[PDB]
């Protein structure tokens, strides 16, 4: 229902309050698994930030199962820059950050306890185009 | 006794009184001390020859009345290039001051280090010394060599080129040692690369003959956009990466035109023929940036190991696939078959095609790049190549059989194009496209005579005077012999702005490039103009829609591959058509054979012999009767696999080899007329009989 | 009168905005964001910035005007006042005036402007390119206010709503915009994030 291009919302949690709503009357509907918002999938959207953009037209949020789905596809299968080095610090003016990306594994931007929890394993590291990704908390074991 | 040390820069005048009074005096050893005590440091080189441009020229011709210099020459030039290390690696010359680039132009001007005793500790260490400079300098030195002649430009980089033989000569080269493990190598091949820079830049490079992508809104897969749905803004993506030299002076290896040097000149083949590239994939992919990837050098790699590179990466493509569909199949729980079984008709081939591949490629463009397992109906069994090599050939048959209208035919250089002004259907040309990428990927040769046209246009380009030259010259030698003409145009031929088009039924259609194309007169106050409007109009923008499909194809069965840059367009046509050159001894020394005669028997022998009988037409033509191909396969006549086996005893009952596998299954005759009878016969009945 | 403009979200073509970095919820951490509910915790005259990017290049060069507009309305027309404790005390640095509390420390680029439209004194911000191209631009503002001085103070939050001026007739610029300096500073964010879910 929302059509315009430069007036894109960005966070649910934003778009809470135009939608005649203080925390807990969003109601809307995802794509990829084509079903209604879960107070818990709210949660996790929050948690991951993401950038909601309209589909054919109509704004649609996003799930929370699906998030290991649309992702896991592209961490084995592209791969660039992969040290700890200068590899992305002169290619680029600004380095980076401490140790935060656009996380495609724990997907959210920088998990608190995520720093050292990959370097105490040393087995294949996913630096995906240069991306320091991690893991998260709802993904730690085999579930 | 003066030790002439109140002097610490040299100059023309300074170096001229010092040489007068040491000819004066008639001892070198002043002035052996001087130049030992200018060339021990890089600061005096710094200082040295600083005009209040001549004196590189001149001056340096007087150095060699002698020969003891030249001892404390290899010596200072041993000694100095570690300082230069030490002066390069940290400390930031260049962007302190500008006034720095003198000490290695001093260093490489003098045309005669090139004598074998230097080049075992002088210039490599000079190399060595060479590879690593400021991003800048690089550009800046580049300028120069660019802008200069073309004959010493030729000289240094063959210079360069023996250094690099002569290490592999004498290095050796293994699975445990690279060909990048060695840090004097490497840095020869950079500074070689520096070269190649300036030798392509010396050329009629250009960027405005580029045509615009104008990709349609190709169907995308959701995982692209998901990450602008992640957080992040429209990616510049992460795929196809440039060298950074290219950024530096916006010149790309596909702008070249016409080269001062072809560049097959560069390429180091006692280099190329040692190197390894099955694991050099992976030092350059994941981007390791303590050894260098020689694909970043695109031009001391030959045919064969590019093509390796890229089999390889379809190789990790196709394990990346199965790795992410066994999890898939694992959760999701969705049935997908690895194998492209395109399995057809025998006679609605085209069609079944159509209605399967497209259809499994909507779903996943990198379904195409995948190994096909062609079945059809009514035989079975496992399939190694020998149907999928009938599907291939009958197809392209077909499709150059006139029963479609679609591939077109010239007799004045044996080519086959698309037709100039059809009216398709979308989906003919996209099995073309999908079958060529298979040939690509299917290490199979494909009989076809695309020009260089398709492959370039193919790569991103557009077509040029020599790419005009390729199907009909007489257009653009009626064109250069304009290009010269002084005269009045209008006065003597008063022919209107527009020539001609061709199309299906031949009629000379209307066509006026702008309006009133037939009342603009020819003007000859201006001629680049017609130059530029002809290099666009008659080279493009005729096939757009047509071509656009194909290229879509060609596009969707490989775009995530490294295979934009690697092969020129002058380079992927080796992989499916075949080698143009036709050596018989590669075949001699490459030769397996099989069953149960030994090497060494005469009979063999004497069938070479009757082979040697023919001349390199007859010997194209055998190959073309017998494999099915007229050129010799990728790495020509030296790097197939091909087969001798034995159909039986000495008879003439059904002399016929497995064509399926490129098995030469002749039968052992004794007598050698008959032999020679036999094979004359073969040669003139080659493909008229439609076995092949 | 002192009409705001409406809360909408207004980003463009091209863009151009803030991204913000998570490190924990520990109480000496403060140089992170709220996740979830879009909450600055940083410390009162503290630095504590998190990186910066921009698309490729925005053309740089003209100030827009932010005000910080309240969220209650019964004194969405109250002009913002500099707390008369820090107002008083000698603790900027003497080109900041006692009225204001922007204290441009992240940027060199903005001066205080003494708006009349409505009696209020916007601010404008730095519409810059911040390093131009990198990863979660995070402009460093860092703010000195005491919000409970028994005067016009009245604990409250404000908006740096973001107005563009230029060439052009329209008014750009309306992102998820958080500005505090009252109550907590830093400190940890998951005790807020679990009392405010609940309502």
Known sequence: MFQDPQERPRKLPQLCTELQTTIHDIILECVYCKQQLLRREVYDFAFRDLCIVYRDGNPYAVCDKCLKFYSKISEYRHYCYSLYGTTLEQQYNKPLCDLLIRCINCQKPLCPEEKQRHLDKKQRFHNIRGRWTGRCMSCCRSS | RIDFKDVTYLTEEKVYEILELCREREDYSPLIRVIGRVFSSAEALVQSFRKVIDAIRRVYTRLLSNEKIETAFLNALVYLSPNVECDLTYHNVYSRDPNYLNLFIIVMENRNLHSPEYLEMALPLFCKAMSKLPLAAQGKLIRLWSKYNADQIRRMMETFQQLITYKVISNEFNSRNLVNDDDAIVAASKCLKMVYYAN???????????????????????????????????????????????????????????????????????????????????????????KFSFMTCPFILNAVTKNLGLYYDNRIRMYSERRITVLYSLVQGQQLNPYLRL?????????????????????????LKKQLYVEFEGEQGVDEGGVSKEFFQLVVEEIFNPDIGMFTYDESTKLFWFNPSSFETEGQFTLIGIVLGLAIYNNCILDVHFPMVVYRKLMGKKGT???????????????????????????????????????????????????????????????????????????????????????????????????????????????????????????????????????????????????????????????????????????????????????????????????????????????????????????????????? | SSSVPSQKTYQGSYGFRLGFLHSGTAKSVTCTYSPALNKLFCQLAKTCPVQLWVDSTPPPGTRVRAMAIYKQSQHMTEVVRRCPHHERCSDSDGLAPPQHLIRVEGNLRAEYLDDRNTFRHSVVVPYEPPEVGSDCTTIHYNYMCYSSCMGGMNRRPILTIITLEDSSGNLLGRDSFEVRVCACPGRDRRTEEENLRKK
Request: hydrophobic share 35%.
């Open chain 2, 200 to 290: 392509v830049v010396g050329g009629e490079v250009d960027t405005n003959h580029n045509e615009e992508d104008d990709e349609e809104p190709i169907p995308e897969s959701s995982e692209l956009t998901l990450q602008e749905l992640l957080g992040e803004e429209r990616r510049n993506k992460k795929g196809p990466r440039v060298d950074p030299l290219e950024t530096e002076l916006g010149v790309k290896t596909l702008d070249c035109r016409k080269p001062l040097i072809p560049f097959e000149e560069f390429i180091n083949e006692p280099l190329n023929e040692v190197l390894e590239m099955d694991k050099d994939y992976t030092f350059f992919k994941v981007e390791t940036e303590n």
């Open chain 2, 343 to 367: 399995k057809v008709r025998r006679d609605h081939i085209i069609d079944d095609a159509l209605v399967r591949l497209e259809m499994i490629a909507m779903e996943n463009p990198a379904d």
């Open chain 2, 465 to 692: 005077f020599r790419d005009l030259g390729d199907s009909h010259p007489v257009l653009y030698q009626s064109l250069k012999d304009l290009l010269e003409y002084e005269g009045n145009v209008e006065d003597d031929m008063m022919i209107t702005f527009q020539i001609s088009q061709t199309d299906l039924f031949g009629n000379p259609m209307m066509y006026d490039l702008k309006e009133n194309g037939d009342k603009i007169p020819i003007t000859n106050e201006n001629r680049k103009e017609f130059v530029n409007l002809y290099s666009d109009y008659i080279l493009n923008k005729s096939v757009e829609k047509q071509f656009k499909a194909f290229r879509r194809g060609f596009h969707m069965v490989t775009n995530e591959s490294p295979l934009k840059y690697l092969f020129r367009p002058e380079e992927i046509e080796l992989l499916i058509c075949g080698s143009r050159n036709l050596d018989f001894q590669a075949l001699e020394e490459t030769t397996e054979y099989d069953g149960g005669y030994t090497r060494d028997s005469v009979l063999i022998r004497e069938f070479w012999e009757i082979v040697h009988s023919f001349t390199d037409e007859q010997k194209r033509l055998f190959l073309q009767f017998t494999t099915g191909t007229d050129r010799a396969p990728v790495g020509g006549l030296g790097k197939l696999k091909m087969i001798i086996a034995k159909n039986g005893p000495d008879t003439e009952r059904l002399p016929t080899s497995h064509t399926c596998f490129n098995v030469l299954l002749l039968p052992e005759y004794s007598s050698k007329e008959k032999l020679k009878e036999r094979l004359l016969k073969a040669i003139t009945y080659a493909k008229g009989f439609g076995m092949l």
